[PDB]
A paper describes a structure:
Recent work has revealed that Mmi1 interacts with Erh1 to form a complex, called EMC14, and loss of Mmi1 affects recruitment of Erh1 and its associated RNA processing activities to target transcripts. Here, we present the co-crystal structure of Erh1 in complex with the amino-terminal domain of Mmi1. Our structure reveals that Mmi1 binds homodimers of Erh1 in a 2:2 stoichiometry, via a conserved molecular interface characteristic of [name] family proteins. Structure-guided mutational analysis shows that the Mmi1-Erh1 interaction is essential for facultative heterochromatin assembly and for silencing of gametogenic genes.
We used a (Gly-Ser-Ser)5 linker to fuse Erh1 and Mmi195–122 in tandem. The co-crystal structure was resolved to 2.7 Å resolution by molecular replacement. Consistent with the 2:2 stoichiometry model based on the results from the SEC experiments, the co-crystal structure revealed that Erh1 forms a homodimer, with two Mmi1 subunits bound on the surface of the Erh1 homodimer. Overall, the Erh1 monomer adopted a typical [name] fold, characterized by a four-stranded antiparallel β-sheet (β1–β4) and three α-helixes (α1–α3), with the α-helixes on one face of the sheet. The outside faces of the β-sheets of two monomers constituted the homodimer interface and formed a pseudo-β-barrel, burying about 1000 Å2 of solvent-exposed area. Each Mmi1 peptide was bound across the β2 edge of the β-sheet of each Erh1 monomer, with the amino-terminal residues (Mmi1Lys96-Mmi1Cys103) located in the groove between α-helix α1 and the β-sheet, whereas the carboxy-terminal residues (Mmi1Thr104-Mmi1Arg119) were bound to the hydrophobic core of the dimer pseudo-β-barrel. When bound to Erh1, the carboxy-terminal residues of the Mmi195–122 peptide (109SYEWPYFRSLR119) folded into two consecutive helices, consisting of a 310 helix (H1) and an α-helix (H2). The Mmi1Trp112 aromatic ring stretched into a deep hydrophobic pocket formed by Erh1His9, Erh1Val70, Erh1Ile11, Erh1Leu13, and Erh1Trp25, with its Nε nitrogen forming a hydrogen bond with the side chain of Erh1Asp27. Indeed, Mmi1Trp112 is crucial for [name] formation as substitution with alanine disrupted Mmi1-Erh1 interaction as confirmed by GST pull-down assay and ITC. We also observed that the H1 helix toward the amino-terminus, Mmi1 (96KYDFSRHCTDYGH108), adopted a long structural loop conformation featuring several turns, which was constrained by an intertwined network of both intra- and inter-molecular interactions.
Numbering used by the authors:
A (entry chain B): 7 to 45, 55 to 101, 121 to 144
B (entry chain A): 6 to 44, 56 to 98, 121 to 144
The structure:
């Protein structure tokens, strides 16, 4: 029952907003990396830092609520993900579910 | 203040139509979702055509967002009343730096 939502805003204009939901932290990291690869590591963190706003929300099983984190929180996890391995399109793999009907919170209400 | 509401919106079946709005009060979220409709029995059909809408309501103590079903925003929009540009007034802030949670840890 892991669920992570990324509130992404590409530029200073809120018109560029898009959100992604994933079933695990690895899926969230693989998503944002796959977004950068729609066109190096250090150049990737250049791309990540250029994102105007990106606040992750992680779901808590017991409290049944989403914990907000800073943009730096996803930086640290993405950093250690890339160590163990050895126009941008933000809709690429931007969801592991078809509808919020499938999210862990809404399934528990049945 | 410490009141924040996030609307996770997906217009069509394709997740490319995803957009999220954040507001400082429940009234602002309702006024926003009404403002996008006008860009009144047809308002029900507009809101029902939205493929997915998850309101996230912030709790000041627990410092977490409470997920709600789409009907929770519909019912509050109904009380307020007694193609579409979902970017119109879609934020009461300029950055999440101004949100109540991120102001709380200062």
């Amino acid at each position: 029952e892991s669920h992570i939502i990324l509130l992404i805003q590409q530029g200073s204009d809120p018109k560029t907003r898009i959100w992604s939901d994933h079933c695990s932290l690895r899926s969230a990291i693989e998503y944002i990396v796959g977004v950068y690869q729609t066109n190096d590591v250090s150049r990737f963190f250049n791309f990540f830092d250029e994102i105007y706003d990106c606040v992750p929300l992680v779901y808590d099983r017991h409290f049944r609520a989403y914990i907000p984190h800073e943009k730096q929180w996803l930086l640290h996890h993405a950093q250690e993900y890339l160590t163990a391995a050895r126009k941008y399109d933000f809709s690429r793999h931007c969801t592991d579910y078809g509808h919020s009907y499938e999210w862990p919170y809404f399934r528990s209400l049945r």
